A paper describes a structure:
The disialoganglioside GD2, in particular, is a glycolipid antigen that is highly expressed on tumors of both pediatric and adult cancers, including neuroblastoma, retinoblastoma, melanoma, brain tumors, sarcomas and small cell lung cancer. 3F8 was the first anti-GD2 MoAb to be tested in patients with neuroblastoma. MoAb 3F8 is a murine IgG3 with a moderate affinity for GD2 (KD = 5 nM). 3F8 binds to FcγRII and FcγRIII for neutrophil- and NK-mediated ADCC (antibody-dependent cell-mediated cytotoxicity), respectively, and the CR3 receptor is also important for cytotoxicity.
The 3F8 Fab structure had an immunoglobulin fold common to all Fab structures. The heavy chain residues 129–130 were found to be disordered. Disorder in this region has been observed for other Fab structures. Attempts to form diffractable crystals of 3F8 Fab in complex with soluble derivatives of GD2 were unsuccessful. We identified a single point mutation (H:Gly54Ile) that showed a modest increase in binding affinity in GD2-ELISA assays and an increase in the ability of hu3F8-Ile to retain binding to GD2 on a cell surface.
Numbering used by the authors:
A (entry chain L): 1 to 92, 96 to 214
B (entry chain H): 1 to 82, 82A, 82B, 82C, 83 to 100, 100A, 100B, 100C, ...
The structure:
Amino acid sequence: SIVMTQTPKFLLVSAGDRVTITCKASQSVSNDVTWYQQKAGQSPKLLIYSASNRYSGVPDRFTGSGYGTAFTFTISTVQAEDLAVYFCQQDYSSFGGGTKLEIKRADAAPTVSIFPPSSEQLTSGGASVVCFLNNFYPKDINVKWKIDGSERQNGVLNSWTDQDSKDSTYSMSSTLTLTKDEYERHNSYTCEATHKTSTSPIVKSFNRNEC
Amino acid sequence: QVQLKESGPGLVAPSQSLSITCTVSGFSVTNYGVHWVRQPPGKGLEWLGVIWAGGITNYNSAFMSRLSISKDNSKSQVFLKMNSLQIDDTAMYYCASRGGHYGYALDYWGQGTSVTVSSASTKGPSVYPLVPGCTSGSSVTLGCLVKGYFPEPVTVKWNYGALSSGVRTVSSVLQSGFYSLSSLVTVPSSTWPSQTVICNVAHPASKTELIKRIEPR
């Protein structure tokens, strides 16, 4: 029970920009504040201890300051790979609510691939068709499926990657899952991707009888 | 070098207990305290308690009569037991420790063990090849579609981790009580199929380790 109020909750910054996160303690705590970095799917990593000391291995662009109640953590010059959640801690049970650092970069159009169901899945009674949209920015994107030239919305599941550590782009898959019987009732399968990079869609298609 | 490593069940039924072990190398649990910290999905950390070198335990009171931390110095193991789980106990569970005079900072963390609380049943994934249908192009994108598993997580590697550049693994999606994801990799269209490409899919809950070779139509 000390509260660490951490702001902002989200940052969107370009590579090379400066970031500053603040944690305000509910009581005066000298320099007894820690900063951690947690990248997607990883454990926390110590960056800064006793308010202002860089750990071992921590790069110079990471700094902390403060004493008493108002604590600051700064990244001088944000690199692509700094995409992470950052948070403060006071005593062992007092954490700040975290700051998600997201990267903005130049808009990028997706590369589209289409994949028919595999023979293995067909044997199981299932048929998933996948449309993969790779390396685009920003994250928002649309996919429209047509079967025998008719729009099909049912059976579609969409899912994105986390932002890329190196290039700061997103990728996503759109998966249309049918039964084998339904799949075998139709021949042409098309997906159409539309992204803000163009009013024109990007299409990929196949025919089951060729596949 | 120091390593902390959690081991745990993956799935716990509502109202039942969770037992996890943290195994330590690189320092003596006789001399250093070891903490438990958890992280519910998409949320922040939550400290549970600590067992100090001498054996004193301190706990987070939000867990008042529910938690037991203990250790066996002779096995370099620290244990957590948490009674009466409910769905909001679903979390990643970490053990953590401090190797130096870093104030309250913990510099050592385990990889974590994922715990899901649910009345449902562990179910191994099926893995299906994503192979270009029937190409021109300087690159080729290949993939593995992983469906029907429960609980989370699964991991996907390509050529046992050796193929890392150009790997894209989407988030899992929950539908009808089961998870699916896909993982894709882009390689030069010269490199496949002339060199073998396989995906490696692990699902710790069912102790599953699959290999699927991607081959040309």
